[PDB]
Design a protein around this ligand. Structure first.
Ligand SMILES: Nc1ncnc2c1ncn2[C@@H]1O[C@H](COP(=O)(O)OP(=O)(O)NP(=O)(O)O)[C@@H](O)[C@H]1O
Ligand SMILES: Nc1ncnc2c1ncn2[C@@H]1O[C@H](COP(=O)(O)OP(=O)(O)NP(=O)(O)O)[C@@H](O)[C@H]1O
Ligand SMILES: [K+]
Ligand SMILES: [K+]
Ligand SMILES: [Mg+2]
Ligand SMILES: [Mg+2]
Lengths: 606, 145, 606, 145
């Protein structure tokens, strides 16, 4: 049949590229800087083979001249310029990118990496300007004027009224009557500090005598090796990409090569607020809203990620759905895991890192399942054998005796409440070290880890058993049946307040305590669950070596198992041990009333 | 062509609960405890515990389930079906207990078959909220975060 | 001078509309289904003036027949069809939309609202297919075949081997080898459920015995009259926009017809989900990631919003920044505030709503400001006069006596702890009702409201002044200096644990109590801050008429200010008041040691 | 045109604190209390409290401030400056206290001037983090969730 080639409606395609492509209208300055940066790379590539190309204009810069009294925003550069044919073929044809043809015509192995590769970015300036008056000047051609008003046609006239420029392009933009905000000083600096901050060429701005201020003093550090970058240069780079007022605590600058080539300079701040990772392609900011690039628990670090093979969107405000994100996501976590190990090699620097980001390290143990063992080696806590200095899980198993097969820990509201807890005297007698957990997020990480180097994590607040000699067990079991009438007597008194009352030999000084049931929320976990603004079984145990419990043993022998006077004490002793174990005290008024009655007895009043 | 429905599919879930198989097995059968983590239940039998071939409605009658086969703390088979589904569509939930005494937990292997192809993600997104998270929050069978 | 019209490079523009736009590849089905919907609207508009247009085929449907044997995804519709001239101009020209031209030729007062308005949605099928064979058939022309390979030209041949369809278009999509995922039943139904679920015309799918299944069975309700829709129809509509299994609690179906006309059917679920509001433009799902659409505290509300005059981009996946979504944000909150008032008019319906979204309503009082007073009418709490049922802030003021000028409340960990708190008896003597705050988010709402109908919110756990007469104030000042040597004696014992010891007459049944102060956090607030996963001052008060404090008054009269016995009872009474006021003990071990001493002497243990 | 710099701008903040105007006034002057919410401070004078015409560096030395004028619990005027800022840029921040007796709070009206146009939003977002929320979370002068 008849074969027809594809066509395009020019009067309707222009409205689509301008109006229905970009979400914001301030990106027009980003593209005109990118076009000026590409033009400066073309004249620079020719300067390496011929130095006479820079005789007209020796300096390479991008100048922005706002004119409020004339409603004109001039953007002048000193690039290669456009000849008479380039103003019609490259600039006058939609989807025609002269920069793309320049990258394909150069020799294989060139160091230049230009930005423009689509051919429609120039038409973005009409979002804020009705008519443009682009003026060009090439070394091999005269000076012309490219005037257009986003209509159906454009006009190219020989420049005979404006000033004679040496080399470059002068883009005169007549801004709209409702887009005059881009004539101010702060608005221009806001767009440059957001999209064109790390341009390799100086961006000059004429501010009010008249002076020129450079808006890109800070140069990108991902174009240099980490071996020739000083520490102070990383501080100025961190204070430029982020609004923080403090220097970064640690810097991780790595570069992945091979199939995927991308560079990233990740910074670790000195404090936590309780995205941050920017994306740069062709030295141009793309987006910072890619939450899939970095995990949520690891989102406390800042920095940028430079790449050149990412499939950018037509609007260049984001990138397409691709399988490269998880590849970069893997290398970011892999390098930050090693970055934390480099901080762990030091003692004073890791003290500031762990005291500022203790939550983030413990959240990764709870959420991530691949680096859970690597993050467990970074945890630091207190213990019975380490009261002042924080000890690690690796140093814990080194001090474990040959017979100890489990890692013991304890949770609580504060450190002073767990250091004198009635559950430590049993393990301290057996020389078993017990870790101290004082933050609400500790138990959320120990519930997922459950094992470190083969050692099972055991919580001493929950019910558990310790190994002992067969001679000692035969002496304890015969003592349990002696206290059997006493244990069953305390069950009818407490009722359903506890699951059961059993004799415990893990309590030396304390008269009694309430344990958990080896399952569900512990004493501290239920306190956290009932305290979240946006969001079990217990066992009562007594110590048979305390004078209080020994006195209760003879009371049931004389027939006082259901005595009224003993109920005022066994109920007070039960609620008192609830405070030591960390359980919530129900009806505190009744607990205080029974205390006030004993205080009255101490004051000899009825 | 003739008008009809589509084929079915199957999914596999494996939630881990900090509760032994003796208590977790009674969670899916005790009517007084089923009403806790569901907040809406309609039992048609006066018995306190669910029996074989016993139908009951959940979540305002939109979820129709029936216990078909069950072993002592090891197996649980239900005929799960949604009210929005058509007549021939019917699914079967196969629950297998994998209690591990080393860590004091139980990983309930759920082999759910018979769900439509267009509802394999709908019943899965709600299972981690109405069956997994609802039990872990009402009875406290593990930390939720 | 020399005027030139804008041009467009075909070989480069075709790539910019395929591999640079449409970041997701599954949207090709969303465009072909929509293009079939516009064709069915054109033939339907012609049926109103000529019923013979539907005599070639009376049924209106969109059929999708997958063929895995030949790797072809066929999409057939019975729309208006394209002639030989329309296959070259409307289909072969980029940015040329024959549907947009049909809208401009509609008669005055038309009701049809077609989707296609750009002219590039057809070319999206090349993301998953290397070549397409569009078979069209119009009533005014023969049956032709439109074939192309996404290159630089297309072929139009007369159909001589395919089926002789009556009317419509058949698109043979030869899917790529790496895009064969769209040949399965599960993947096709996933795209229709996501994008083209609410198409007005039936969408048929060939499921393999060959049988047909309609995918768009749930018709949209925003087109119908809200007064004509039954309650069961809203339940079936809620099961489609959301995967929830529970029926919606309340439905708010409104329509604004001002400058920005849009429909919105907002649903209230039965359980909290701890976005949810979808955006539709002309029966097509646009996006569900609208930030400014709905506030943060209101995210529990579900439903959809259907508008027409929205700035869709080239990809139709997001809205342009035109400063118009804040108007929809105002109308959504305006109608949902009134929606909550209609639920409040019903007794049982509001109990189910308040018990499910208690924290959501109180969260709005914390952050939102313009509707902070409106959300205060929805707050329900318990009190001394409303122990069983809940009461609102409006009913509280109605029961306030003529001499009460402040709203009294109390925070705490649980309801049983605050119902018997010693801070209530001071207001119960004055017959003042005191609200009960039992949730951690309660104090965050009262700290931002600070007033209701002119009545100042006063927390009784904090320091406050209760009105008294001159006959009683002369008695209190006469008794304060009598206990002045005692208050100073209790200050040296506690030291820096409390700022001062003040004789308080707001304590009747309790010997002593502790308040934080007038400013800053309360007793319950600091307990919540020290318990969050992502995350003071005390004033001692004693009762001058209690038998314990009066017995301590004679102790210092005998020179017992530094006595050894008074120090044990003072610290015991101090830490006991920490439990009743809502504080946490510095160390429960030491508090239990003092109790175990009183238990020992209570049993005559030497 | 010669190479230089730009002009300056001004902002206005009024965060509400739950602290008396007398106690909040001592927070910005007591050197031992400044180190609580700043975590890094270097004072050059021997006095225990800040004095007029006294320079001090904050946050590792990048924030250079100087108390130039102050009234009794009502006014606090400083000279805020960043190490990254140029030499002629020397901002002046004024703190005016307004205590609310009926609500028991203090609205600290901040009249900040002398800020560069490029660093306007930088010092505004960090003021809510290094000054507003840092004091509310350290001394308990506000409920932050
Ligand atoms: N300031 C300039 N100086 C010199 N040549 C320029 C300038 N701006 C544009 N050009 C030329 O005009 C062509 C059209 O560029 P443009 O329409 O902006 O798209 P592009 O930059 O080439 N590709 P993209 O940036 O992805 O849209 C460029 O390829 C250059 O050859
Ligand atoms: N299935 C179809 N049946 C009949 N005519 C069709 C069909 N698909 C497309 N057309 C015609 O071809 C034209 C080109 O449409 P298309 O390229 O898909 O973009 P559009 O739908 O017109 N606007 P948009 O959807 O925003 O991209 C339409 O305007 C119709 O006139
Ligand atoms: K161009
Ligand atoms: K077209
Ligand atoms: Mg460009
Ligand atoms: Mg289309």
């Amino acid at each position: 049949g008849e074969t027809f080639e594809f066509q395009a409606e020019i009067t309707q395609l222009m409205s689509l590229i301008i109006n229905t492509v970009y979400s914001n209208k301030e990106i027009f300055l980003r593209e005109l800087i990118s076009n000026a940066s590409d033009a400066l790379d073309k004249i620079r590539y020719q300067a390496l083979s011929d130095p006479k190309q820079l005789e007209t204009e020796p300096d390479l810069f991008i100048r922005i001249t706002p004119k409020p009294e004339e409603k004109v925003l001039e953007i002048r550069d000193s690039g290669i310029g456009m000849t008479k044919a380039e103003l019609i073929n490259n600039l006058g044809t939609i989807a025609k990118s002269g920069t793309k043809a320049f990258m394909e015509a150069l020799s294989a192995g060139a160091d230049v990496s230009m930005i423009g590769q689509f051919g429609v970015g120039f038409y973005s300036l009409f979002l804020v300007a009705d008519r443009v008056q682009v003026i060009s000047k090439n070394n091999e051609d005269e000076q012309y004027i490219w005037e257009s008003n986003a209509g159906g046609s454009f006009t190219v006239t020989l420049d005979e009224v404006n000033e004679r420029i040496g080399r470059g392009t002068v883009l005169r933009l007549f801004l709209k009557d409702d887009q005059l905000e881009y004539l101010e000083e702060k608005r221009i600096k806001e767009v440059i500090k957001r999209h064109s901050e790390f341009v390799a060429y100086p961006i000059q701005l004429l501010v009010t005598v008249q002076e020129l201020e450079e808006l890109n003093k800070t140069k990108p550090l991902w174009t240099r090796n980490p071996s020739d970058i000083t520490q102070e240069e990383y501080n100025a780079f961190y204070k430029s990409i982020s609004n923080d007022w403090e220097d970064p605590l640690y810097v991780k600058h790595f570069s992945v090569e091979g199939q995927l080539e991308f560079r990233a300079i990740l910074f670790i701040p000195k404090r936590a607020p309780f995205n941050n990772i920017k994306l740069y392609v062709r030295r141009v900011f793309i987006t910072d809203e890619a939450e899939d690039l970095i995990p949520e628990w690891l989102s406390f670090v800042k920095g940028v990620v430079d790449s050149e093979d990412l499939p950018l969107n037509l609007s260049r405000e984001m990138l397409q759905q691709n399988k490269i994100m998880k590849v970069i996501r893997k290398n970011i976590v892999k390098k930050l895991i090693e970055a934390f190990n480099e901080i762990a090699e030091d003692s004073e620097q890791f003290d500031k890192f762990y005291s500022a980001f203790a939550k983030n390290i413990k959240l990764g143990v709870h959420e991530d399942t691949q680096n859970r063992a690597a993050l467990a080696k970074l945890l630091r806590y207190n213990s019975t054998k380490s009261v002042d200095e924080l000890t690690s899980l690796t140093d814990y198993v080194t001090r474990m005796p040959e017979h100890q097969k489990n890692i013991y820990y304890i949770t609580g509201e504060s450190l002073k409440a767990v250091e004198k807890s009635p559950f430590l005297d049993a393990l301290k007698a057996k020389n078993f070290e017990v870790l101290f957990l004082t933050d609400p997020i500790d138990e959320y990480a120990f519930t997922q880890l459950k094992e470190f180097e083969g050692k099972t994590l055991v919580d001493i607040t929950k019910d558990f058993e310790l190994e002992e000699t067969d001679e000692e067990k035969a002496e304890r079991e015969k003592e349990i049946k002696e206290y059997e009438p006493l244990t069953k007597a305390l069950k009818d008194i407490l009722g359903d307040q506890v699951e059961k009352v059993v004799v415990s030999y893990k309590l030396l000084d304390a008269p009694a305590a309430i344990r958990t049931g080896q399952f569900g929320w512990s004493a501290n976990m239920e306190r956290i669950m009932k305290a979240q603004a946006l969001r079990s079984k217990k066992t009562f145990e007594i110590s048979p070596k305390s004078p209080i419990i020994k006195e209760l043993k003879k009371r049931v022998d004389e027939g006082g198992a259901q005595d009224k006077t003993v109920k005022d004490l066994t109920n007070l002793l039960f609620e008192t041990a609830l405070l030591t174990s960390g359980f919530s005290l129900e009806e505190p008024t009744s607990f205080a009333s029974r205390i006030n009655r004993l205080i009255s007895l101490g004051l000899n009043i009825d | 062509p003739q008008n009809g429905s589509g084929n079915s599919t199957s999914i596999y879930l494996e939630p881990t609960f900090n509760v032994p198989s003796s208590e977790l097995y009674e969670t899916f059968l005790d009517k007084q405890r089923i009403l806790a983590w569901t907040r809406s239940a309609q039992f048609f039998n006066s018995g306190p515990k669910l029996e074989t071939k016993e139908k009951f409605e959940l979540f305002g009658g939109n979820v129709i389930s029936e216990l078909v086969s069950c072993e002592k703390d090891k197996k649980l088979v239900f005929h799960w079906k949604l009210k929005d589904w058509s007549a021939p569509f019917n699914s079967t939930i196969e629950m297998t207990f994998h209690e591990s005494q080393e860590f004091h937990e139980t990983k309930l292997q759920v082999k759910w078959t018979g769900i439509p192809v267009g509802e394999e993600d709908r019943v899965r997104a709600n299972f981690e909220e109405y069956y997994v998270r609802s039990i872990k929050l009402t009875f406290g069978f593990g930390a939720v975060l």
